[PDB]
Amino acid sequence: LPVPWPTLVTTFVQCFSRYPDHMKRHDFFKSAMPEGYVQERTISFKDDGNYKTRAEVKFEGDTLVNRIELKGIDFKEDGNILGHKLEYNYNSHNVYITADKQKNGIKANFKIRHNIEDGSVQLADHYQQNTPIGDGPVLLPDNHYLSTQSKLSKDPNEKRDHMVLLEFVTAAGIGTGSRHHHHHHSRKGEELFTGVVPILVELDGDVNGHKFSVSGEGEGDATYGKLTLKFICT
């Protein structure tokens, strides 16, 4: 793998976030299902290169799949990314979501703080836009945030280069007086997430001409804002 695993966490399914009852009317991600959404990002590593990503997230039968292309350029050979100088861990923080009326979707920007091995912080500035694939109605949200927590681990019986990921995501930032206390909204999309959903993730990448692929498997339980994924280089 040509880059540190933590640098890919954000790229490797926000439809698995927990939206409590009063906020379900703001859940763009599930509302776009099963047709899905396109997710695009620029990720700018301070003093280093950038990733640009395009993904389609949708249902194929009973499976939520996230297929990604990533292009990374302008990285330093001996910088924190290509030189693998980032600790294997991950900071919890809040991702703020706003509607993007023009693309019938959402945007977000947020900064990830990556610990550097024997140094300070490598910042990764994220710009994100999401657009529905289908033409059906979607839920465009009021401003809110996703409180996102991520634990990184290893499988002691896995010989391949890999990452195990446990994530918990809960929406917040809207109070119960919002929209005159009205919870009502269409449950289309949302109803597909009431139980445990299998996930496939597949990525093709090229970072400074180093080409690689990753596959990931696991499951999501949105009732608990819970995701479990294991990723391997392929």
Side-chain angles (χ1 to χ4, degrees):
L1 193 72
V3 296
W5 281 106
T7 72
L8 298 178
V9 169
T10 58
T11 300
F12 294 144
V13 290
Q14 290 162 313
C15 49
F16 291 104
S17 312
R18 173 168 176 262
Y19 282 70
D21 292 336
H22 72 302
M23 283 180 80
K24 290 177 189 308
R25 70 170 290 167
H26 304 282
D27 185 345
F28 164 87
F29 301 107
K30 300 191 185 51
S31 83
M33 295 297 162
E35 297 90 347
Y37 56 79
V38 178
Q39 180 159 299
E40 288 158 295
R41 294 214 182 90
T42 303
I43 299 168
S44 300
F45 296 89
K46 183 177 180 323
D47 300 327
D48 212 328
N50 61 86
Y51 295 159
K52 279 197 96 205
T53 64
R54 189 181 177 286
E56 280 177 4
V57 184
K58 70 189 189 276
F59 275 88
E60 284 184 8
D62 63 350
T63 300
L64 192 287
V65 305
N66 176 17
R67 304 176 192 285
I68 313 134
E69 304 176 291
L70 176 147
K71 182 66 171 307
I73 66 171
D74 290 345
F75 285 87
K76 297 194 254 129
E77 310 66 67
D78 61 1
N80 293 143
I81 288 71
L82 299 178
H84 289 80
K85 304 177 194 185
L86 300 186
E87 293 179 354
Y88 193 74
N89 53 39
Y90 217 87
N91 185 48
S92 311
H93 64 113
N94 290 333
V95 176
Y96 287 80
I97 309 300
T98 57
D100 188 331
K101 199 186 177 60
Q102 300 293 326
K103 293 181 289 297
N104 207 24
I106 67 84
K107 57 189 198 310
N109 69 90
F110 54 98
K111 266 206 198 60
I112 304 284
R113 298 178 65 78
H114 297 294
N115 298 338
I116 302 167
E117 291 180 344
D118 293 335
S120 293
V121 68
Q122 178 57 73
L123 300 176
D125 193 10
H126 287 60
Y127 282 80
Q128 175 185 338
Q129 68 177 50
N130 293 233
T131 317
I133 291 176
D135 292 347
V138 289
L139 296 167
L140 294 182
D142 290 351
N143 297 359
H144 69 282
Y145 64 88
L146 292 182
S147 165
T148 311
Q149 170 191 306
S150 300
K151 169 82 196 194
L152 275 38
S153 63
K154 300 286 181 189
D155 167 359
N157 290 117
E158 184 55 74
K159 296 191 71 68
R160 304 181 291 290
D161 190 19
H162 73 280
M163 171 167 72
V164 181
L165 174 63
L166 170 60
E167 272 199 339
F168 287 98
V169 186
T170 312
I174 292 183
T176 55
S178 164
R179 304 231 154 200
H180 296 289
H181 307 256
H182 286 55
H183 294 200
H184 176 75
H185 64 284
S186 187
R187 302 188 155 64
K188 300 153 108 219
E190 172 192 309
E191 49 171 16
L192 301 180
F193 289 92
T194 57
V196 179
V197 176
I199 298 162
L200 177 62
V201 175
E202 284 189 302
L203 172 145
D204 282 342
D206 175 334
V207 174
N208 273 43
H210 302 286
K211 295 187 165 161
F212 61 101
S213 295
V214 170
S215 61
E217 300 184 309
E219 60 192 28
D221 206 347
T223 296
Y224 309 102
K226 181 165 73 182
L227 277 167
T228 35
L229 292 161
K230 181 172 176 183
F231 304 90
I232 59 179
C233 229
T234 48

